[PDB]
Amino acid sequence: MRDMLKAGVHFGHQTRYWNPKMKPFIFGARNKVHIINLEKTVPMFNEALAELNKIASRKGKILFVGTKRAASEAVKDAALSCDQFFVNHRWLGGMLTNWKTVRQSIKRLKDLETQSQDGTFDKLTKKEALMRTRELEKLENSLGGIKDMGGLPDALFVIDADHEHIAIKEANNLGIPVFAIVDTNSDPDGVDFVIPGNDDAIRAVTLYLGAVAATVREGRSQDLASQAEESFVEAE
RNA sequence: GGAACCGUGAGACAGGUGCUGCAUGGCUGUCGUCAGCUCGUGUUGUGAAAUGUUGGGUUAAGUCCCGCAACGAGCGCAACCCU
């Protein structure tokens, strides 16, 4: 299980771009950073983790959102260790509402690939061929992790409430739990299960994102394994 | 007996570029062949609607990025035909 006393990674962050709604989580600004209370972050871990093991052993799906280039690689690897979804690139309008039509783009993507591998690849003009290439690109860039979705999640996990504020909204009107590790620059009232921690910093996000993923595989139907996200922490 | 065309007598009936295209269909001219014109969804407004195509640098051009409540899509241009 997770470990306490993490005053060497997360802690305070951001200078003066905070939100008065995060006062009950700020220890005390010193020369710059406001500093977050590690004494309040721990209690949040328990409550947030508790609700996690509940949906984890309940065979519930989670969608880890991560558009920020600070945890772009961590959000994926963490979602790979387990059988969960994720959003790295950018978060279309009507993916869940107008699922049908949206999937039509997925089928076409699979239809073009089967035509790009070897079957009728260089039969028609090159101009038309270069037209099918761009389509594939645009489709592979947007429909990268949504291609595995064949049916409408139980909860979403964001890295930053503000950056992925759009994902938070659509997660509120639908009545779906929201888990995230944001800091000062945000509104906690928008997150039923918020984790007061550094939003940025790769070594900061990888820690929880790795522990949370480890707590998911355990108590479900798998054994614990070493985190491979630590290798990307060398970005420093 | 009787079909047909035709002529006279008799009966039932025809026609109109005569008016109105501010009653209209169709066709055509004109800004134009100039050119953009619109849709789905999200967001803003009580609403008619707005945003989407705002901002910074740039380009012949929404030409294209960066930031970005917007993200995408269908006619127009272009291409397809002919000298």
Swiss-Prot record:
- GO biological process entries: cytoplasmic translation; ribosomal small subunit assembly
Q: Which SUPFAM superfamilies match?
A: Ribosomal protein S2
Q: In the record, what terms sit under GO molecular function?
A: structural constituent of ribosome; zinc ion binding
Q: Enumerate the Pfam families for this protein.
A: Ribosomal_S2
Q: Which CDD domains match?
A: RPS2
Query: What GO CC annotations are associated with the protein?
Result: cytoplasm; cytosolic small ribosomal subunit
Residue positions, PTM N6-succinyllysine: K110
- Keywords of this entry: Ribonucleoprotein, Ribosomal protein
In the record, the note on similarity to other proteins reads:
Belongs to the universal ribosomal protein uS2 family.
Q: What does this protein do?
A: Required for ribosomal protein bS1 (rpsA) to bind to the 30S subunit.
The record's subunit annotation is: Part of the 30S ribosomal subunit, contacts bS1. Some nascent polypeptide chains are able to cross-link to this protein in situ. In collided ribosomes contacts ribosome rescue factor SmrB.
Protein's name according to its UniProt entry:
Small ribosomal subunit protein uS2
Source organism of this protein record: Escherichia coli (strain K12)
Q: Which gene encodes it?
A: rpsB
